[PDB]
Amino acid sequence: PETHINLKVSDGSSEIFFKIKKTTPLRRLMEAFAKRQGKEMDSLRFLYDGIRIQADQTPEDLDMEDNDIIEAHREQIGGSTVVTTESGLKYEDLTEGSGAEARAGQTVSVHYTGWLTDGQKFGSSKDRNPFAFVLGGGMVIKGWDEGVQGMKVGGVRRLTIPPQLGYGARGAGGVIPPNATLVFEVELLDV
Numbered sequence: 001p002e003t004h005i006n007l008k009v010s011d012g013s014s015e016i017f018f019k020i021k022k023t024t025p026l027r028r029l030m031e032a033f034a035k036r037q038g039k040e041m042d043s044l045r046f047l048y049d050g051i052r053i054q055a056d057q058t059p060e061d062l063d064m065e066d067n068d069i070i071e072a073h074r075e076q077i078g079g080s081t082v083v084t085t086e087s088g089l090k091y092e093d094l095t096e097g098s099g100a101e102a103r104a105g106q107t108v109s110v111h112y113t114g115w116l117t118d119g120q121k122f123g124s125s126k127d128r129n130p131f132a133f134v135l136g137g138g139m140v141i142k143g144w145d146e147g148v149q150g151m152k153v154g155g156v157r158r159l160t161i162p163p164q165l166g167y168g169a170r171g172a173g174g175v176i177p178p179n180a181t182l183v184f185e186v187e188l189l190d191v
């Protein structure tokens with residue numbers, strides 16, 4: 001308790017915790033986070049109380065206390081924008097794609113992960129090797145048909161789907177509770 005500190009790291013999708021010694025540089029934490037996510041350190045930016053953290057700073061330096069939150073930002077540099085459409089869907093482009101644009105009628109290929117609003121993962125295509133569907137076909141949940149349109153190949157878009165655009169009061173047997181808001185990260189691979 002005296003020498004070590006537990007810190008919560010949030011990336012807007014899930015939360016995990018890191019216990020390090022108060023005199024250990026935050027580099028150790030940042031690298032553990034990056035590795036766990038399969039991400040390069042150069043593509044991550046970490047903030048605490050709105051101030052940019054540097055890898056050589058320690059929890060002691062920053063007067064951190066147990067359960068304090070560090071924000072991990074993976075999104076493009078420049079400032080994020082969260083869009084709420086006419087339907088109540090929300091989306092956020094974490095990475096802007098450089099390739100072909102996804103349009104209704106195409107059979108598009110994506111990777112995804114889905115979480116509940118508490119950061120519990122409910123599904124993913126990555127956990128073992130890509131998911132293809134007819135975009136705009138009414139075959140997937142409404143949030144997806146609406147949310148994946150306009151993405152570009154290379155893009156990573158975070159969809160926040162209110163339950164009437166998801167599984168509603170029914171939920172999905174075994175997996176999604178009644179009245180659940182769903183968070184997905186979708187990476188567009190082909191169109």
Ligand SMILES: C=CC[C@@H]1/C=C(\C)C[C@H](C)C[C@H](OC)[C@H]2O[C@@](O)(C(=O)C(=O)N3CCCC[C@H]3C(=O)O[C@H](/C(C)=C/[C@@H]3CC[C@@H](O)[C@H](OC)C3)[C@H](C)[C@@H](O)CC1=O)[C@H](C)C[C@@H]2OC
Binds near residue numbers: 112123139167175176
């Ligand atoms: C032939 C039948 C099985 C067939 C299953 C697959 C091809 C395998 C595929 C990887 C799905 C996963 O199977 C491991 C599993 O993925 C979830 O975990 C998940 O992450 C999720 O939410 N996804 C998957 C990725 C696209 C978005 C969303 C979805 O839209 O999924 C769609 C979905 C369930 C739509 C319902 C359909 C009924 C409507 O009434 C309802 O309307 C409210 C909406 C899926 C893709 C359907 O088009 C096709 C199927 O169902 C679900 C929580 C439960 C689902 O298992 C079924």
